[PDB]
Symmetry: D2
Subunit: 387 residues, 4 copies
């Protein structure tokens, strides 16, 4: 069977299994979960660690006294289970004050508060051992054109991230930032909507090396993009610092279904890619047990996330190890794709008559790519109608 | 009225007004247009210049003799009308040989041919005065997961663009490259699917300064993204080298409707942005007169592209010049957005009790953003129910 | 200018201007509004009437005593302002008990309760003068495949609507039902996702004459469909009993922008259709003032809804009245469209050699449709760059 | 293993395996296939029959002499292989004459010709044994608002279908019509865009019993709708006369991938539904072997279509037969869903205090739906990590 263990690196945010089920058209269907209780239950399921927004662990507005009490109970559970906290993040979207954003809110005082609220949680994150600090600008964006001058908001966004970079370096912390893109929801359009936009923005920061991305399966799919393709680019750039796994059934509201659900073939290609590329970070599940579920359903959903990754991991491996597939990859020229186009150089290429003057485009065009046979072998492997 | 003149910088590709109407489910509805004839007619309409793919001007496979004949007739028309050729591009998608791509085709010999075919047209482009060379990788991508290893294809894509950069510099040409993103069609998923992905990729090239983007209205909208937002980021990065204007009615096949059609409010915000940011490049129309049209319809469609830009330009200007709007912008705090969040610095911000310890989130949250009044003033201006 | 008066038939639901701003990722940004106060403010704005879900007016679970108190205060305000209540609906989506639906919940006791809760509000609706009773099954549907057997769910949906038909007829009420379609959100997929699905379902009810549709601009656009076309099919079938007006910027979460926002050209084509078809029912606005707004913004947004309808109404009338457009419609053969294809009969059509044997498809194909010139005239009229 | 035999009812259209690969941006990648050869190769693969558009079999404009020759060769191949022709359709989209539609073209003579061309192929279809005649109005619709008055277009659509109904009945043919919906492409918006719209339209025809739908997997997904749910509504109405199977990767151009590709979980839920509902018609594959493929790839892709249906059929049966799943269905109350809500009647429901007055919504709300465990079982069965 497929039983997860801490070595598998499966992590969960407190807000995932802890989601009470409030949606835009309805009230909570489940009671609140004590963070300490979630930690112990996730440990029992084979999880590696947990993540949290400051506000999931400490109630907004809690006194320094209550704050210490909450952190103590959480640390107690971490200590008893040996659970890790690989990532932490700030909630800059729930309180009404962040209605127009945090780092790019038109109001300057709100932008200052947002940075302060973030810096306070970075200190806690480091104390708990987090190696990555995520930033999801859920409120950075707009519903109307003139409400937000995007060039100046990008100036404010760069300013905020640069200030965080200075803070972290001045303090000597060993923690990196990962930007989590999302195209829309709750704002009509959110700034840095996809992996590409986030990656481009990072290269304009003062210390680009401190920032990467934390893409989420469902978010890129909300723009109808290919997640494995985007992950490949992030990997090619050396910026996949963390990753959120879940499922999404197409272009609509952010569903956060458990991993495996939604686009199954995309899940398969994603796992094949992560494992083949040797990604070593956490396999974080940012999902929401549907509100139709009670607590037993919550834990079944969480268990399902990990199980599916394990089954997909086995199928991906079987796929790549099969000699019939290696033969099909050669037939489709995946090996030729790895050869430099012009290792001989520009001047040699220009003088090469076989590259143009004597090239026969019709003969070359006649060669079938053999992509369908390869894809069907992949399907067979996924459905276990073969390895 | 709104009569265009060469000063307005409106350009058209030969393939736009020249599109014969062949679509995936039907035959051509119009006869072919001689390039020379298009140039003269567009000049009569007030166009500034024209653009072309090598294959629009010279038939694929034409001998050196026929090639010179075709270029001569075209140059004659340019000379007689004073029309400019600001941009040129290569067709690496029509011939069957490019069925799996040009720069990233699995077959190495095809990749070499693709580079050679491109370099040949760069020479011609420069000769005709083009300042920008566009690259739309319509065939770079895949329909199935294993058919294309994306990390290695990005290696091949980087190799191709680097080789082009070396060519251009070795020759001393004063021409820049602009990558045109598209999410899908004709491939299931195309590499560098959006403005952001293209922008991120560029920063990994050997000479990033030589490359920018040529975004197209309809393409970003195919991913359901906000075009004006994406243009702002490209502008903030200093990479908007050229731009394709057209219309698209949502997430579906690439329609290439005339500019103005499709998302009208987005057209308004795009024009407001281009004009306010002071973009000085061509206003290129990459559109397709619907196949229901005869030649009179073709020219009416082309004229409509320019007219709409002119009307929108006037409304945008009226909008920004209105004192009631300037008042509404102040009410929405667009002025505060331009102020640095922490011009006083990190240390001052950390010691600032009004930024956190004494900040009142409820009072600040109570402040309405006044975004709806502003947006309605914008609507009034667009519909001319005011300036 | 464009001032609304009760004759314009603009209505608003209490939940529109009263939306407190709680979204899936954030707390309420505005305090609650007393139904009585909303009625008085909407009257001042020129609205014709209001609509309500039972739970907007009477708190869920309130005693018969408290219920009467709430109803009394509401009626006092209606009486003092002369405001009408043309439509009412039931909230079968907010309380956790409806997590799997009302009429199609798997649990039989919940389905029974849903019917009883509905019937109680139908009595109230009739008492207040409502002519249409709306049903939006926002919770009817599923997130996973086996959770719902759709054929049997449709049996339960038919049963519920048939029971309602029986009740209404037994009581002798003069009230009709209108189904409001929506493709998804809050459920992964919602049953009767579009206007077409609802129209088809209705013809399988016992008394089809009692039911119609209450389409919503933004809902059909969530499926990327053409709203005006859908409204035309509902008009053609004689089933447009009511309509919800708002705005949507593409395929994503239900935005409920004020009317005019989102797809502006669609809004124009819709107004053109409603006015030319002579739709006499309410122009109901089911929208939500963005949570970035305070109360002044709420009222500004609501006023905007009516203003935009009025401006669009003027431009559509101007467009249709223009002699140049009438000439353009004839050129595009809109008049030939109205002539029966075979008024002469099947037998005559079969014997007609000009319809096949002697028909020249190439000559006929040569005729341009002249659709672009016509659409540009439509654009000129919308932008007021003509009448 | 999973070998198909004629008993499986798999059929293919001549235009599927015969698609030459011409797409909007590229020339044909494969040479044409002789209909006779396709029939023989499909027979060897285990197909049950073939379908055709009139123009696939007989070249547009061919003389009566050439026509008979083409038909003769086709019939020879059918006779020799025992291959059936269950469905036939008319091509009313390729020739320029149909640029504005066939049945709803603005030009009256084109509408007449469209009907005559259809009637001629209906005679041929019946002669060859077809039981269903499909109609895909791919050209019925528009790119702009005033180009088509949708109410009158629907009048023309009804008129055409009614005329066809009259013809079929007058001739005493035993053939039924099936409308194939599609939301867009090649037209900006196509009339009767979804299954629901087509179902509703049918009930307004003179003889509704003669018409049903021929839904296509990829078409409904182009609107982001749930195909299995749509198929359930068509089954519930008794209108699933035929079905097109293929794959689609989201909202974008019509991909026509081989069945199994695209949304795999949907493909499983669809097979589960077709097999459990006892659909007895053809399993028709309307797909296109990617243009990257040569002829070996074409046949591999076609074989894949059937293989995937067979594997999915096995897993769906295994899922339903599993005792653990039957227990899970009972836990989720799928059985309660089948019990009438009010078998006791309206009057009894009204008098029932347990249905309202004494109902406890909080207790009932507390019951978990147990949908996640059930869906995970479904996943385990699909992946073969269980039966
Ligand atoms: Co999410
Ligand atoms: Co996430
Ligand atoms: Co385009
Ligand atoms: Co373009
Ligand atoms: Co809505
Ligand atoms: Co509504
Ligand atoms: Co198709
Ligand atoms: Co089909």
């Amino acid at each position: 069977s497929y039983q997860p263990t801490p070595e598998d690196k499966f992590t969960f945010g407190l807000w995932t299994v802890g989601w009470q089920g409030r949606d835009p058209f309805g009230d909570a269907t489940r009671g609140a979960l004590d963070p300490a209780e979630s930690v112990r239950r996730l440990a029992e399921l084979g999880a590696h660690g947990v993540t949290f927004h400051d506000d999931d662990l400490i109630p907004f507005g809690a006194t320094d006294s209550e704050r210490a009490e909450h952190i103590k109970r959480f640390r107690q559970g971490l200590d008893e289970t040996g659970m890790k906290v690989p990532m932490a993040t700030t909630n800059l979207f729930t309180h009404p004050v962040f209605k127009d954003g945090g780092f790019t809110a038109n109001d300057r005082d709100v932008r200052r508060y947002a940075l302060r609220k973030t810096i306070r949680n970075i200190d806690l994150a480091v104390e708990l051992g987090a190696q990555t600090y995520v930033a999801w600008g859920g409120r950075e964006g707009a519903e109307s054109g003139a409400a937000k001058d995007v060039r100046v908001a990008l100036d404010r966004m760069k300013e905020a991230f640069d200030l965080l970079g200075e803070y972290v370096t001045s303090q000597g912390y060993d923690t990196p930032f990962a930007i989590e893109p999302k195209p829309n929801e709750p704002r009509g359009d959110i700034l840095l909507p996809t992996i590409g936009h986030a990656l481009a923005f990072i290269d304009g920061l003062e210390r680009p090396e401190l920032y990467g991305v934390n893409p989420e399966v469902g978010h890129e799919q909300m723009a109808g993009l290919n997640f494995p393709h985007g992950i490949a680019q992030a990997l090619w750039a050396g910026k996949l610092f963390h990753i959120d796994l879940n499922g999404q059934s197409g272009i609509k509201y952010d569903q956060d279904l458990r991993f495996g659900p939604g686009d199954l073939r995309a899940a398969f290609w994603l796992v094949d890619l992560l494992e083949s590329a040797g990604y070593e970070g956490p396999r974080h599940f940012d999902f929401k047990p549907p509100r139709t579920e009670d607590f037993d359903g919550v834990w079944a959903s969480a268990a399902g996330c990990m199980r599916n990754y394990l089954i997909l991991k086995e199928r991906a491996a079987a796929f790549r190890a099969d000699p019939e597939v290696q033969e099909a990859l050669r037939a489709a020229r995946l090996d030729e794709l790895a050869q430099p186009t012009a290792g001989d150089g520009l001047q040699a290429l220009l003088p090469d008559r076989s590259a143009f003057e004597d090239f026969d485009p019709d003969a070359a065009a006649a060669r079938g790519m053999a992509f369908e046979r390869l894809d069907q072998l992949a399907m067979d492997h996924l459905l276990g109608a073969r390895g």
